[PDB]
Amino acid sequence: QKLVLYETRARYFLVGSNNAETKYRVLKIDRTEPKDLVIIDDRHSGLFRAVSAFGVVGFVRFLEGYYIVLITKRRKMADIGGHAIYKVEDTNMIYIPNDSVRVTHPDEARYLRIFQNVDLSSNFYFSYSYDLSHSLQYNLTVLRMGICSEPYMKYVWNGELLDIIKSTVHRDWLLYIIHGFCGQSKLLIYGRPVYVTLIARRSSKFAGTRFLKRGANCEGDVANEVETEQILCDASVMSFTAGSYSSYVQVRGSVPLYWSQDISTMMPKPPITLDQADPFAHVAALHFDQMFQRFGSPIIILNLVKEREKRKHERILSEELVAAVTYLNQFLPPEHTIVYIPWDMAKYTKSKLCNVLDRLNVIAESVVKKTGFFVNRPDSGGCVIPTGRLQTGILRTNCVDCLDRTNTAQFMVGKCALAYQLYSLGLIDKPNLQFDTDAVRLFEELYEDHGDTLSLQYGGSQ
């Protein structure tokens, strides 16, 4: 919940705005020789201005001093099933010293500058009631509605900032913001009021002795990964109006190839050493094991070829991925578990390109189902009475392919799924939802915005 703070010579004191129960904890960062974090009884300072803030994101020790990172204000970007999603508007980095010049030297100052740049450049989101770090399907599994213990570590942006507080264990204080995009739009289809939402969360990269953005580490973590989730809330017209909520998730990320890569583009073209040893097989396997755990029932991997090869435009990473996937030939319950599809999606972009997308779906369809999405029925009050279905599988695209193309693939796939979700509620008969012009426009705009927001990673290619 919201927090309130008092600052004095002693340092900073934080407490929940609303104190439920007799014993409420106070967090104190101390000015003293230690700029330690402490847990205190409710001896909050009596005199001083009380400042209200949306959340205490955490603390960081830059060189000698420790700073508190705070999200002062937020705006409500979305509301689903009673949960409110907020974006952090204004933030602050606060230090105990009150103009400690001596403490500050250029090394520490530089660090703060770096952090400021990141806080400014990024867009963080959180919900007090709902865990944004996890997909709706994952949250369903967790169950007890919270809390920070349950969040998905890959996505918990302020995991590191939280370290001191996690040690102590004052749950109210720990709130896990997200980087990409979140928006909802109200629409009407067949006289049924509807809320459509789209959220993209981008991954914050990861633990390990050494690093590299592209590829997977020994542990099986890729570092560049995003989840895109389409959510819908509608009321069944027929019968007592029951509210249904749906979620459909997709993933995009770096090709799970061991990070060791010869980036000597300058020199002659590199061949990638998949594994005289076996890191490529090992890393990929470990990555896939994680993916199957989270997403479950198969991960269908879509790789977009886009190569004539007359020029013989062959990519080392491209071939590597397929060979590795084939080599693993995942098996365990019936079905491989991971399916691989190379797919040619070429121009003309507004015509032939879309047609191919549908073709891609068909091929996937041999393997995947439109029905596979999360669905639940809440009561008035927004609690969940039933769980109609859970999403077993996920379609994973590649970060390397054009964001333009991938976004298109994701958008189209979501439309195919949406139709079934509308069917389920009985909002639409067997026919196509797309016919509704206003609705499609809303839908298109939502996705277009998403692509714009997400394209934030880099600007360019050759």
Tokens of 310: 């007359």
Q: Determine which helix (DSSP H) or strand (DSSP E) holds 410, and give its type and residue range.
A: helix 403-425
Spatial distance between the Cα atoms of 59 and 333, rounded to a whole number of angstroms: 45
Spatial CB neighbours of 193, under 8 Å, sequence gap ≥ 6: 186, 187, 234, 235
CA distances from 99 to 14, 288, 325 (A): 21, 50, 57
HSE toward the beta carbon, residue 415, CA cutoff 13 A: 23
Spatial distance between the Cα atoms of 27 and 5, rounded to a whole number of angstroms: 9
CA distances from 252 to 90, 225, 256, 396, 446 (A): 30, 6, 11, 5, 18
Among 396, 418, 419, 393, residue whose Cα is nearest residue 409? 396
Q: What Å resolution does this PDB entry report? A: 5.1
Burial of residue 140 (CB within 10 Å: 0-12, 13-18, 19+) is middle
Spatial CB neighbours of 429, under 8 Å, sequence gap ≥ 6: 423
Spatial distance between the Cα atoms of 10 and 40, rounded to a whole number of angstroms: 13
CA distances from 26 to 57, 137, 272, 299, 460 (A): 15, 34, 54, 45, 48
Handedness of CA 412, 418, 420, 422 (dihedral sign): negative
Tokens of 200: 């993209």
Query: 258 and 280 in contact (C-beta within 8 Å)?
Result: yes
HSE toward the beta carbon, residue 383, CA cutoff 13 A: 4
Spatial distance between the Cα atoms of 302 and 342, rounded to a whole number of angstroms: 6
Query: In the chain, what is the greatest distance between 2 CA atoms, to the nearest angstrom?
Result: 77
Query: 56 and 148 in contact (C-beta within 8 Å)?
Result: no
State how beta strands 83-95 and 26-30 pair: unpaired
Q: What is the DSSP letter of 237?
A: S
Tokens of 390: 């859970």
Tokens of 247: 């979620």
Tokens of 120: 């400014």
CA distances from 86 to 204, 270, 451 (A): 19, 45, 20
Question: Omega of the bond prior to 348 within 30 degrees of 0, cis?
Answer: yes
Strand, helix or coil for residue 148: coil
